Design a binder for this molecule. Structure first.
Ligand code: HEM
Length: 146
């Protein structure tokens, strides 16, 4: 889990992103697919399509809102080590179930702070909080197999 200070920083930098949830979730998933294009092959709905077809698919919103809803839950429970511990091992089992491993979350981790900051300049220290949150997810995936 994150410390109280990291959780607070993550929460503050996430609020303006989540306030325009639908559009920012779509733009997140599109940014992830543009510059890690094999990410799209893990999704049955997107496998084989170019990013232009994904941008126009109505399934974009389904997957992006699901991601932002559960990311929101992680952010607001981040400093609760027992809740975090159970959420992470949910999350890891579900993703290993779809063939997703830690390498894919290393990719998310590398772009996430820059995505958040392009919606709104975050307080100082917010990237390291986000980096640590994804490192917990990456660890849980490794612990669950890959
Ligand atoms: C960015 C952080 C992410 C969060 C918070 C997240 C969250 C979720 C959630 C809540 C689900 C639905 C689970 C269920 O219904 O059982 C899901 C499904 C899925 N996720 Fe993730 N996800 C993230 C990143 C990724 C990444 C990076 C990949 C692969 C590159 C991925 C691949 C998938 C796939 C393939 C599914 C199943 C889609 C379907 O067929 O409905 N997710 N994700």
């Amino acid at each position: 889990s994150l410390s109280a200070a990291e959780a607070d920083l993550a929460g503050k930098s996430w609020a303006p992103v989540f306030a325009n949830k639908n559009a920012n979730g779509d733009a997140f998933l599109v940014a992830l697919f543009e510059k890690f294009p094999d990410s799209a092959n893990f999704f049955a709905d997107f496998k084989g399509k170019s990013v232009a077809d994904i941008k126009a698919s109505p399934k974009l919103r389904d997957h992006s809102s699901t991601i932002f809803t559960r990311l929101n839950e992680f952010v607001n429970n981040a400093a609760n080590a027992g809740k975090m511990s159970a959420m992470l091992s949910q999350f890891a089992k579900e993703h290993v179930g779809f063939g997703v491993g830690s390498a894919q979350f290393e990719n998310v981790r590398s772009m996430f702070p820059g995505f958040v900051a392009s919606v709104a300049a975050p307080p100082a220290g917010a990237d390291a909080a986000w980096t640590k949150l994804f490192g917990l997810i990456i660890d849980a995936l490794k612990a669950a197999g890959k």
